[PDB]
Paper text:
CD4+ T cells recognize a broad range of peptide epitopes of severe acute respiratory syndrome coronavirus 2 (SARS-CoV-2), which contribute to immune memory and limit COVID-19 disease. Analyzing six epitopes, some with very low binding affinity, we solve X-ray crystallographic structures of each bound to HLA-DR1. In summary, each peptide bound HLA-DR1 canonically in the “forward” orientation that is described for HLA-DR,48 excluding CLIP. We observed little deviation in the overall structure of HLA-DR1 irrespective of bound peptide, particularly within the peptide binding groove, where the solved diversity of bound peptides had little impact on the position of the HLA-DR1 residues that lined each pocket.
More recently, S761–775 was identified as the most immunogenic peptide to induce CD4+ T cell reactivity ex vivo, including in subjects with no obvious history of virus exposure. Despite very weak binding to HLA-DR1 in vitro (IC50 > 10 μM), not only were T cell responses to S761–775 observed in all three of our DR1+ donors, but the peptide bound and was crystallized with HLA-DR1. The structure of DR1-S761–775 was solved to 2.5 Å resolution in space group C 2 2 21 containing three copies in the asymmetric unit. S761–775 bound HLA-DR1 via the register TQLNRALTGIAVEQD, which placed an unfavorable Asn at P1 while placing favorable residues at all other anchor positions: P4-Leu, P6-Gly, and P9-Val. Thus, lower compatibility of P1-Asn for the P1 pocket, with preferences for larger bulky side chains, was the most likely contributor to the observed weak affinity of S761–775 for HLA-DR1 (weakest of all crystallized peptide-HLA-DR1 complexes) when considering binding motifs. Outward-facing residues across the core and PFRs were very diverse (polar, aliphatic, and charged). The weakest affinity, S761–775 (IC50 > 10,000 nM), was the only complex where the P1 position did not incorporate a favored aromatic side chain, which may point toward an increased importance of peptide-HLA-DR1 affinity compared with other pockets. S761–775 was more stable in comparison, but exhibited a single mutation, N764K, located at the P1 anchor residue position with HLA-DR1-S761–775.
Numbering used by the authors:
A (entry chain C): 1 to 15
B (entry chain A): 0 to 182
C (entry chain B): 1 to 190
Write the structure that this text describes.
Amino acid sequence: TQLNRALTGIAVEQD
Amino acid sequence: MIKEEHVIIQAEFYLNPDQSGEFMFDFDGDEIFHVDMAKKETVWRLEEFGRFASFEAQGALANIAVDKANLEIMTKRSNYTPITNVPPEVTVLTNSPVELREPNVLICFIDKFTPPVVNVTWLRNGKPVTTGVSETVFLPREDHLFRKFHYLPFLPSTEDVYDCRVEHWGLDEPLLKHWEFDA
Amino acid sequence: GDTRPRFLWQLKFECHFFNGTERVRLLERCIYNQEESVRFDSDVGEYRAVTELGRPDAEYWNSQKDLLEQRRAAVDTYCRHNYGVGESFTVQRRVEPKVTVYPSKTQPLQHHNLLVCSVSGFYPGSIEVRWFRNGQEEKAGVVSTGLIQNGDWTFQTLVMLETVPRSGEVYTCQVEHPSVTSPLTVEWRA
């Protein structure tokens, strides 16, 4: 079976 | 929409203070799969989907972590501005034309609401019925509200009435949507 | 009961496909509560802030060029890959509808009635339903519910005809869907 890919979110600016 | 257009959405959310997370994929409005934070497994909406595609649920956990961390930052950055409760619209339908004494399904469609927390109860003749019941996860909408489907298999008769009881923080009172056989 | 305030964060990755995979647009969106704060549009190439709440992020993220490169390449490494992985059971899904015709309420002849054509359990959603009275297309008393999404990758529709039935008349519901080569036809004889 083929693998479904997922993007990951980027950490938000902790300013 | 555009006949030559198709849309795949990867939708995640984290909700405080409930500490509720969700990770799912959507195609043209229908859920392909979601990751169950309990049991830690990928759940495919239809069984055939799992026979051509796969997804490791652990990676989704990482995403939820980021989301949690980001939420707690944005909450602070907004000066702790809370979400506005938007009450849901509730509809009760049947899956197919009703034939007496032939198995069918009651569909409770909950639409256009936020935050994604809702309490759903099926009632047959005023008593809660819980056997055979299913439900989808919260489905994303473009206005960033949510949809949900609840399902109750049943045997149509002229002697039973049904209700979907929906509870949401945006409703003043619990909302009962009624279904009867009319003939 | 529970009255504590709530705080919601949503992350959405939308892949838009045109002409199969000829054109692809990736849209990453961050939504706080019910407000979009920042988005990445592959047609723009960088993060842009939607609300003030998102301006720092759009700046911070737009300084990570490795991030920007991976996101600009995701239209192939992510969107097209997923389209190819799921094409067999999504874009190519075909489920044939079941068509029944029945009177809405039981009442005598020469009296207004609602004829229901139920088209249920079909995918995808593009469908065409027509009513005919003795072979002539009825385009006047036709009341449709529209597309109803059942949530299990099936659709249903009720298309109803306002009629004054008379003995000998034959009403016909004809449906065309991408899952059948020939039109489906169901008749009701008054």
